[PDB]
Each structure stands twice: as C-alpha cells, then as structure tokens.
Amino acid sequence: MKNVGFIGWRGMVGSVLMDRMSQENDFENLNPVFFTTSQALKSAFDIEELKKLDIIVTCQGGDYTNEVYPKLKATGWDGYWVDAASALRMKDDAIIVLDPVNQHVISEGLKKGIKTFVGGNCTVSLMLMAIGGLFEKDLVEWISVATYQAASGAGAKNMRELLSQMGLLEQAVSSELKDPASSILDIERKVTAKMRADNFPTDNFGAALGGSLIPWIDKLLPETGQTKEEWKGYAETNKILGLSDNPIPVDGLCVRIGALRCHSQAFTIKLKKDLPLEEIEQIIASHNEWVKVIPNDKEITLRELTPAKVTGTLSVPVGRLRKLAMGPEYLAAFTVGDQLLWGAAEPVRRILKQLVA
Secondary structure, X not given: OOEEEEEOOOOHHHHHHHHHHHHOOXXXXXXXXXXXXXXXXXXXXXXXXXXXXXXXXXXXXXXXXXHHXXXXXXXXXXXXXXXXXXXXXXXXXXXXXXXXXXXXXXXXXXXXXXXEEEEOOHHHHHHHHHHHHHHHOOOEEEEEEEEEEOHHHOOHHHHHHHHHHHHHHHHOOHHHHOOOOOOHHHHHHHHHHHHHOOOOOOOOOOOOOOOOEEOOOOOXXXXXXXXXXXXHHHHHHHHHHOOOOOOOOEEEEEEEEOOOOEEEEEEEEEEOOOOOHHHHHHHHHOOOOOEEEOOOOHHHHHHHOOHHHHOOOOOEEEEEEEEOOOOOOEEEEEEEEEOOHHHHHHXXXXXXHHHOO
C-alpha cells in the first residue's frame, strides 16, 4: 500500500487529524511514517527520507512548507503533497480541497497531473459546507459576510488566553455575584477595570477577547483595504468552485469573538432568481449529509444553532432562513461550524482517504 508521511501531527490541527483518522480506521489502508522537527521518528528536514514517500501530509505550517517543499520538488519527486497551511493554496499547480463541494474539481486535477492538494480557509470552508447547494445551482450573485470567529483559528495559546481572561473577569467580582441583592453597575465597573488593567493577559490577541471582540483578523492588504482573512472570502471561494473565469463576489467583516472552536457567520445572500423559501431550504439541505437546516423557531435555534451545540461535531447547522426587507431575492442566513473539523482537519483527512484508495 501507499507510503504516507505525517508532519505537524503533534500540533492542534495535527492532533485533531490523528484522532479523526484513528476514529475512522484510516491507518489500516496506508503505511504511516511519522516525522519530527525535534533533535531529541525521522527528521522532517531530511529531503531523502521524504523522497521515498508517495504522499506527504503536513499540518506543520507555512514556514516549514516554504522551506521544505521547493527543495523536495527540485529533486524530481513525483508524489502528493497534502497541506493544511495557506502557503500553497493560490498556486497554479495546486487545488484547494473540500470534496463535498468540489469533488469534480479534485477529480479533474487528479487526471491533469496535479500533485499538490491544500485544505481551505476555515471561514470559507464552513460557509461552503453550509450554503453549498445555492452555489451548485448557480443561484448566488454575491454574499455579504459578518463572522463570529473562535479563538482556535488563531492558535492554541489564543484559546488559553481567552479562558484565562474569562476567569479573571468573574474573579474580579466573585463575591458580588453570589450576593443576589448586589449592584449591577458596580459589578460591571470592576470587570471593565480588570479588562483594562495592565496585568490582564492580552499578549496573544493584542487586545481583550473575553468580554469583548476584535474586528480584525490577520494583516492588512493595502490593495482593497481588506484583512487577509476577509480577502480569502473572494479568492478562496472561487478557486474551490473552479469559477475563477466568472468570479462570484464574497466579502465582509471577519470578527474574533469569545468562543473556543466554532466559527459562526451571518450572511446576506443575493440570489439571481426569485424562489420561495421552502424550495431554498430543500436545496441547502440536500447538498451534503452534514448540513442541517434549523427551522426559524426560538427553542430549536437556541438548542441547535450555537457553538455550544456544534463544538467537536461534524454537523454544519444553518438557520435563520428568511427573505430580507430589501427584496425577495435577498436571503438571510446564519451558520455555525467547528473550525478544527471542516475548517481544518476533515478536508485534509478526506483527500488522503481518496489518494490511498
């Protein structure tokens, strides 16, 4: 069987990949070779040991990829490079994977001779897993996005900082909260003071996340005024769908909120045609087996459409579906999906499964 190498398997995204692969018994269909960057297992920088492999799966990061990949391709290596990092997504000899949405694009690349397959941006992947049916029927003119992004997208230290921040905000008023008759304005004054204090751990985010939000993710791109995260909305959605010759506009604001691992998104989707709400609900629901249409009811939305419910699951619920006041061609949609799964480890796990078949 196929000889597969794994790099960055001990990190957060890598650990979710290892766990999901173990759960689905994916190691039974391949010969795994584990790599490490440590000088304390084979070396991840040994080009000759990597040349022996048929497939390479890396969750190590962009800095590793930009160093090792060109050296390995310069030796004449004919194998497959599977990456979770952004580094190679926008290359001509690379395809962005998300098989329940773009199986036809992947299959055509496997025929053409493309050897580099990269997992897509979290926010973009979770969006496409939710409203993919609409894109399959070419019913989307444009999408306006407003995201509610989790700390896991920024890293492991970032999740820890959020949790530490949440603790200090409560601990600043712990006794006052246990007193049923205490002043709310006094309580708030104290947590806001702790949030603004010098000793408040803001090292990883550069601002407070717990009890707040940060309307900026990744570096500024002077060209459009977007952040790299917001830019990926237009750039990646179209490369995944293969519609780079006829680009469908996807833009908006990417905001970091106090959630652990689920990214949630508010959409304003402009449709090309006027279809009834019941027909749109079926088109969304029938695309894939993970998307779930949550009815526009209070009790069900509170139980289903939240980070609380979807964390650690493969389920991609989409709700709050209705027509907007600016015309029956404007659709409202809210989705919640796990960042580490469909937004990181799952598309990577799925393309590997296909390559070793």
